Structures are given as C-alpha cells and as structure tokens.
Design a binder for these strands. Structure first.
Length: 327
DNA sequence: AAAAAAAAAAA
C-alpha cells in the first residue's frame, strides 16, 4: 500500500478496548498539531513519551497505521505575555507559577488550576497577574510531563506537591472572551512541565506577586485551611438556591455562598438528589474537621474590597489515609 | 446548542 513519511514528537500512548478489540493509539505532535495514529503492542511498549520520531504510515482498514519508526531527536518559553496576544487567542509557551489546584464545586470532571503569569500592558509594564486554567481529568492527566496521573488521587497529589512551583506551559491557548476575561486553556498538544527550581530563580519572586486575577472581574482566588467552625445552611430563595457558608480560617472569619443552578439536561429529581447529597456532605464537614479526621481547603472567589459576593470556587478534603476527596 | 464569570434578596 501507499506509505506516508512524517516526523513528530510523541505525547501520550493510550489503550482503548471497544467491542472486544484492543486499540493502541499514540498522540504525535506534527507541525504543532496533535494527530492520533494506531499501532501494535510492540509499538506501545518500545515507544517512549516526549520523544520525536520519524514514522512511516500505511493506510490500512480505513485507519492510518504505524509500520516503522526511527528514534530521532529534536524548547524556549516566553517569560511574559502581552494583552494583544490574549486578544488574538494565540498559542504560547509561558513560565508560570503554580498556586492552587482544585476540582470545580459540583462539577464531575472539570478542574481549575491557578497560575501567576506576567501580563504586559500596552504601557509596556509587566505585572504579575493571577490566571485560571480549566480542564478535564483526561487532559490534565496527559499534560503533566514526567508525572503519571492514573486516578484523581494522583492528580490531587501532583497538584499539592506542585504548589508554589514554576511551570513551563507548552502550547497553551490564551483565551479572551466577549467580556475582558482572559484565561488559559489546555489543548491536546499542550504540556505542563514542573521546573523543580530549588529556588534557583529567586530574584524574580518579586515579579510573581499578584493583585488582580485577569480571568475574573475585580475578584481573586484564595486558598483557606479550615481550622475552626465550619457551618453551611441551605437557602432556597424565590430565584436563587445557595449554600450559605461560614468558616474559621487561622486569620479571619469567612462568610461565603455556593450558588446552585439546574443544568438544562438535568431532571429535577436528579438535581434535587444531588443537591441534598451535597448538603448532607457539607453538614458533616465540621464534625470531621473537629475530630481531626479530615483537613479542608476552600478555594474562594473573594473580592479584596467588599466581602459580600464571595463564592466558594472549590473545596478539597485531605483525609487521614492520604486520599483526596474533592468535595 | 458558547462558555463562563457574576450573582445578598425582596420590598
């Protein structure tokens, strides 16, 4: 059959079993595009992650296949980013400081990661800003280079031991919505590499101090270790339906809300059951905190000026076994 | 069929 000659960097290898047949597929980075190819078990085992290859491909059974490969060999990340590079929705490689990582409250699959980057005004000044990057479990598992994320506990463990550490963000997409909200996005070929600096880059720590979160409007995200009197009531108002929450961080009493809205494709019975399970699990949280059975972190969308529209972005339970439960 | 921030409610 006809053969295709390509060259590209491997990103991940996956095994999917469907209708009692196993398929080994490799995600390769060719010309800054993620292309999925098929292969055999020898391909699955011999090929290594994050390495370029010279591949020959045969088009068999309506599927591009890998026949032979040659292990070849081959980056620079921008230390900043401009407003216009966010406006154009460009694709960049940044140097960011990881801050927090949590599972969006009430979301089954999506996670949110908080970074500190250097934005640049048209005035030509670089300010360390706080940015949010949402993703799913699959992309987040396949994005951390040199880290094997199998289940959710591994993802949270990587998140917690990557906290306040520097990351090269390869081929991330700089979103910009209709309103002036700028976020980060994780594409198929996007990768996240942890530097393990050992504070080798410390003179720049002054630059990585934030006062504005550019993915939100005059709000930031802050992480609190609940040490005291957690409390959560539920209030169904005429329109809204929110958990009114108070708790006690080592510094401040905090008041907050978790707003509940029914999804379009969500039956009222399923929504009501899910919300009552959320309420039951929140009303048991203070009992677990007091008895030293869990340690709770709350990631909070706080307004630095007026604390009257606080919202809990996420909650994470660290259990005494070491397991992480994303409340 | 965008999605995601912002939303004290209720007189």
């Amino acid at each position: 059959l006809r053969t295709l000659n390509v060259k590209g960097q491997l990103l991940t290898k996956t095994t999917m079993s469907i209708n009692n047949e196993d398929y080994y597929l490799f995600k390769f980075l060719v010309n800054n595009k993620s292309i999925d190819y098929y292969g055999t078990q020898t391909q699955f085992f011999s090929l290594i992650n994050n390495k370029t290859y010279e591949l020959v491909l045969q088009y068999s059974r309506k599927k591009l296949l890998i026949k032979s490969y040659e292990q070849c060999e081959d980056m620079t990340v921008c230390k900043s980013v401009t407003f216009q590079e966010f406006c154009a929705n460009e694709i960049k490689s940044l140097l960011a400081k990881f801050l927090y990582g949590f599972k969006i409250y009430g979301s089954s699959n999506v996670y949110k990661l908080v970074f500190v980057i250097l934005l640049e005004d048209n005035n030509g000044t670089i300010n360390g800003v706080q940015v949010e990057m949402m993703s799913d479990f699959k992309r987040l598992s396949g994005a951390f280079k040199n880290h094997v994320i199998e289940n959710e506990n591994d993802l949270f463990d990587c998140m917690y031991k990557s906290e306040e550490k520097y990351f090269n963000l390869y081929r991330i997409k700089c979103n910009h919505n209709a309103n002036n909200y700028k976020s980060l996005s994780l594409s198929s070929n996007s990768q996240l590499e942890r530097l393990e600096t050992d504070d080798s880059m410390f003179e720049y720590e002054f630059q990585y101090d934030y006062t504005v979160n550019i993915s939100r409007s005059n709000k930031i995200i802050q992480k609190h270790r609940v040490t005291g009197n957690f409390t959560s009531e539920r209030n169904i108002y005429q329109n809204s339906d929110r958990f009114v929450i108070s708790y006690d961080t080592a510094n401040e009493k905090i008041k907050t809300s978790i707003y509940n809205r029914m999804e379009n494709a969500e039956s009222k019975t399923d929504y009501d059951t899910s919300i009552t399970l959320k309420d039951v699990t929140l009303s048991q949280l203070n009992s677990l905190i007091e008895s030293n059975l869990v340690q709770v972190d709350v990631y909070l969308v706080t307004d630095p000026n007026n604390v009257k529209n606080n919202v809990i972005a996420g909650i994470t339970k660290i259990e005494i076994d070491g397991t992480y439960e994303p409340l």
